[PDB]
Amino acid sequence: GGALSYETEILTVEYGLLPIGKIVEKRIECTVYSVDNNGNIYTQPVAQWHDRGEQEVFEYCLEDGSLIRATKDHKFMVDGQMLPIDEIFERELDLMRNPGIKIATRKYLGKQNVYDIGVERDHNFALKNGFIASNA
């Protein structure tokens, strides 16, 4: 089974993001998001709240510098497979994550010298994180 650190943020329908420590310690009734064997995202209630006691926690820092704090043996989704996170780390596999992400806020920075690149076909190019910039 394995376990997660207190502040690991869990998506709930009712409350939005909540720390799993709080969901478990307060045994909060909520609806979480799951994925089936055919890649369908659905929702269902939390059915068991597991307080696993004390265990060794490792902090896994991802390429974008975000953090997952878990025991070595907790499984995470990699393409078509659930694997222990430590193995995912040892094997350099990509964790599955949301294919999309929203813009939270916007700021003005005034004027700057700015740049663009032309390519022959399709007229786009990937940035860090895999964002696709385009001139079309």
Add this chain to the structure above:
Amino acid sequence: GALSYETEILTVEYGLLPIGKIVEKRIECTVYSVDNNGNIYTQPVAQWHDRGEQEVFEYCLEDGSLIRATKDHKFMVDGQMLPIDEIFERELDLMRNPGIKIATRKYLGKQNVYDIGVERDHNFALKNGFIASNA
């Protein structure tokens, strides 16, 4: 439209490079594009455009990462190229690298720790859409 100097471009020969160093130095290199069929291919840079001083906006995404660009510069949304400002206006999702590697691992010693059970499939989504599993 255009982009800030330090916008990191993924190139084959050098990995991630600031578009500013690529354009200013006319660096010959190979970038990654998508076609109309969702398919990612490689392709040399054909033009290096210094578009001069323009108004730049900083777009901060839900994960705290930034895009710095002119308001009109288009970016891909679920198969469709749209001005980044419009993507902001309508709260649309940018695409879309659906996976990410772990760079490093540190020991934090012992902590009280937790897990949740569900009735079907035995997984659940975290922030950023990671899928934690106890199947």
